[PDB]
Amino acid sequence: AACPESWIGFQRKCFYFSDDTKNWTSSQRFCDSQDADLAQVESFQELNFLLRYKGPSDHWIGLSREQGQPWKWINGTEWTRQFPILGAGECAYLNDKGASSARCYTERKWICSKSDIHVGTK
Amino acid sequence: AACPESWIGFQRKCFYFSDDTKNWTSSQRFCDSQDADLAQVESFQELNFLLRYKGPSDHWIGLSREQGQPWKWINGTEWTRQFPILGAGECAYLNDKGASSARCYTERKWICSKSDIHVG
Numbered sequence: 128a129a130c131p132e133s134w135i136g137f138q139r140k141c142f143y144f145s146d147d148t149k150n151w152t153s154s155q156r157f158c159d160s161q162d163a164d165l166a167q168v169e170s171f172q173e174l175n176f177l178l179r180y181k182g183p184s185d186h187w188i189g190l191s192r193e194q195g196q197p198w199k200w201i202n203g204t205e206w207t208r209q210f211p212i213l214g215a216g217e218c219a220y221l222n223d224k225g226a227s228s229a230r231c232y233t234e235r236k237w238i239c240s241k242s243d244i245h246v247g248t249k
Numbered sequence: 250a251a252c253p254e255s256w257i258g259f260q261r262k263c264f265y266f267s268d269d270t271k272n273w274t275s276s277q278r279f280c281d282s283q284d285a286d287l288a289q290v291e292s293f294q295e296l297n298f299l300l301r302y303k304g305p306s307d308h309w310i311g312l313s314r315e316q317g318q319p320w321k322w323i324n325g326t327e328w329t330r331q332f333p334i335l336g337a338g339e340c341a342y343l344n345d346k347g348a349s350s351a352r353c354y355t356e357r358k359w360i361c362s363k364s365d366i367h368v369g
C-alpha cells in the first residue's frame with residue numbers, strides 16, 4: 128500500500144486528518160510517532176486539497192515562527208511562501224478558506240504528511 | 250505513484266472528482282477512457298469518504314436502474330442496501346446526505362474509481 132490505512136493519498140504524499148484536538152507541539156509529537164510531520168505544505172495544489180478535505184474546523188500545519196521572524200518548516204529552515212499566512216500568532220493552522228495563525232498552546236485538530244512508500248529521494 | 254496525478258487515494262483505490270459536468274453515460278465514458286468506472290460505491294463507509302471530499306455539487310456515481318427494477322452497479326451486480334438510493338430517476342448521484350437519482354441526460358459532476366496500480 129502506498130499510504131497507511133486510513134491516510135489519504137494525494138500527489139506522492141499521504142495525509143492524516145486527526146479526530147482528536149491537541150496543542151501544536153503535541154500534534155507534532157503525534158505525527159513524528161507515525162514517521163511523518165505536521166503537514167509541510169509545499170504547493171498551492173496541496174493547500175487546496177487540504178482545505179477541501181478537512182471540513183469545518185481549524186487544523187494545525189507544520190509552520191511556526193517568532194513574532195518578528197519568518198515562518199519556518201519543522202526542520203528549522205525558512206519556508207517557501209506558497210500562500211499567505213494571516214494573523215499575529217506563532218503557529219500556523221488552516222481555517223475555512225486559508226492559513227492563519229494563533230498561539231501554539233491552543234488545542235486544534237491537525238494534519239500529518241509523509242511521502243508515499245514508493246518515493247525515493249536518491 | 251499508486252494513483253494517477255490528482256486522484257485521491259483511499260484504501261487501495263483511486264478516486265477522480267470532476268471539475269467539469271457531463272451527463273451520466275458520457276461520465277462513464279470518461280471513466281472507462283482512464284481505465285476506471287463511475288464510482289461503484291461499495292459501502293456506507295466509502296460513502297462517508299466520498300461525501301467528505303466531494304463538496305457542494307451533485308456527482309454521478311456508478312449505479313443505475315431500469316424503470317421499476319433494482320439498482321445495479323456498472324458491473325451488473327445488484328446493490329447490497331448498505332444505504333438507500335433515493336428519488337425517482339434512472340441514474341444515481343451523490344448529494345450531501347447520500348444517494349439520490351435523476352434523468353440520465355442532465356448535467357452533473359462525476360466521480361470515477363479504480364484499484365490502485367499496486368493491487369495485483
Ligand SMILES: *[C@@H]1O[C@H](CO)[C@@H](O)[C@H](O)[C@H]1NC(C)=O
Pocket residue numbers: 149150151152153231232
Ligand atoms: C501541550 O499539551 C500537552 C498535553 O497534550 C501539555 O502537557 C503541554 O505542556 C502543552 N504545551 C506544550 C507546548 O507542550
Ligand SMILES: *[C@@H]1O[C@H](CO)[C@@H](O)[C@H](O)[C@H]1NC(C)=O
Pocket residue numbers: 167169200201202204
Ligand atoms: C526542510 O523541510 C522542507 C519541508 O518538507 C523541505 O522542503 C526542505 O527541502 C527541507 N530542508 C532541508 C534543509 O532539509
Ligand SMILES: *[C@@H]1O[C@H](CO)[C@@H](O)[C@H](O)[C@H]1NC(C)=O
Pocket residue numbers: 289290291322324325326
Ligand atoms: C461490483 O462492484 C461492487 C462495488 O464495488 C462490488 O462489491 C462487487 O463485488 C462487484 N462485482 C464484481 C463482479 O466486480
Ligand SMILES: *[C@@H]1O[C@H](CO)[C@@H](O)[C@H](O)[C@H]1NC(C)=O
Pocket residue numbers: 271272273274275353354
Ligand atoms: C450525453 O452526452 C453525449 C456527449 O458527451 C451525447 O453523445 C449523448 O447524446 C448525451 N445523451 C443524451 C441522452 O442526451
